Amino acid sequence: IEIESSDVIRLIEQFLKESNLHRTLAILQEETNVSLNTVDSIDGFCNEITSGNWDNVLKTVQSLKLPAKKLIDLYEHVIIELVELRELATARLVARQTDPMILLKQIDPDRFARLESLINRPYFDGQEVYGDVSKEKRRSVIAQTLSSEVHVVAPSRLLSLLGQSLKWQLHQGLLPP
Amino acid sequence: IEIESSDVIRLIEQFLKESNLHRTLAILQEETNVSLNTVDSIDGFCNEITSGNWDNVLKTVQSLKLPAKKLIDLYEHVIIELVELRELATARLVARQTDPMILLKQIDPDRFARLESLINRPYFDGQEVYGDVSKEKRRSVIAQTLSSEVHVVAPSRLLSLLGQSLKWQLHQGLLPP
Amino acid sequence: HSENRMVRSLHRVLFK
Amino acid sequence: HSENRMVRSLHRVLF
Description:
Order of helices and strands of chain A: HHHHHHHHHHH
Strand content of chain C: under 5%
Oligomer: heterotetramer
Shape of chain A: elongated
Structural class of chain C: mainly alpha
Largest sheet of chain C: none
Subcellular location (chain C): Nucleus
Largest interface: A-B, 26 and 25 residues
Family (chain C): Belongs to the RED family.
Number of domains of chain A: 1
Organism (chain C): Caenorhabditis elegans
Number of strands of chain C: 0
Shape of chain C: elongated
Subunit structure (chain C): Probable component of the spliceosome. Heterotetramer with smu-1. The smu-1 homodimer interacts (via the N-terminal region including the LisH and CTLH domains) with smu-2, giving rise to a heterotetramer.
Structural class of chain A: mainly alpha
Radius of gyration of chain A: 21 Å
Largest sheet of chain A: none
Helix content of chain A: over 70%
Number of helices of chain A: 11
Protein name (chain C): Smu-2 suppressor of mec-8 and unc-52 protein
Distance between the termini of chain C: 17 Å
C-alpha cells in the first residue's frame, strides 16, 4: 500500500505539457497549488547558478513558479554580480525593467534604493559586500533555496508508468477480488 | 511498446473528479474534446433504457457529454412514452422546460409542432407511431446510439495502475538502458 | 398528479 | 551593448 498526492499531480502536469494542453496545465497548477518545475538535472541547475551563468538560470527561472522573495533575492544578486563586472547598462536595465525588481521597489523601497546606490557608486566596494558573506556562499545559498523549489521528472514518465502497469498485468497478473 | 491515447485522458479526468478538482476537469474536457462518461455498467445503462425507466436514464444523462441530436431523439421518445401513459402534464413540462426540446423547437420547428400535436391529440394512436417502427426497436436504437457515447472505468483506475507500476518496479525491476 | 414513480423521479431529477 | 557573452545572452533572455 503506497500513496502519494503531489507527485501524481506533477505527472499529470508533465503529460499535459507534452500534449500541448497548455490551458489545462495552467488550470491544474492553479487549482492544486502544485507546479511543474522540471529541470534536466538538479545538479546541473545548482552548477549553473554556482558557476554564475545567469542567462541560463534566469531562463530556467522564467520557466518556473515564482515565490516573490526568492526571485527578488536572485535578481538582486544578479545585479550585484553585474555591477561588479562593470556591466552597468545591463544592471540598470534589470533594475528598472524586471518584475521582481519592480516588486522589490514597491514592497521594500530602502532595499531597492540601496541597490541603485550600489550601482551608482564609482567603484565596486567588494570588501563590504562579500566581506559580510562571500560570493561563493551567496551563490550557494541561492542555489539551495531555489533547488528546493524544483523537480526532475523523466521525459514521458506517466506513459512509462502506465506501460509498466500493463506489463505487470500481463506477466504477473491481477490478484483475485 | 503499446499505445492508447483517449483512455489515458479519461483516467486523468476520473482522477480529477475523485479529487474534487472540478475546474481542471472542465477545462480538460473542453480542450481535448474527450469527456468522462462514467456509468456503473454499460449493461445496466442499456438495460435501463430498454426497460423504459426514464427517470434513471435521464439522471444518468445529466452527468454526460451530449450530441444535441441524440438528446433530442431521447427526450422526444420520452415525451412519446409519456403521452401514451397519458401523463400529459409531465409531457408538456418536458416539452417546454428541457434544453434538448427547446433546441428542437429552434432548429426543427415543424418537428416540435408535430410533437406538440401528438401531445394534444385526444387519444394515443399507437398504430401509426409503433406501427411504422416498434417501441422495442426505438428503445433499442436509442440504447445503442447512446451506449456508444458512454464508458465504464473502475473507481480509482489511475492510482491503481500507478500502484501496479510500482509493484512492477519493485518485484520485476527495470531494464538497463 | 404524477402517480407513477418513474414520472416523479424523472420530474425531480430534471427539475431539482 | 554588452561585451560579455553571458551578459548578452542574459539581455536576450530577459528582454
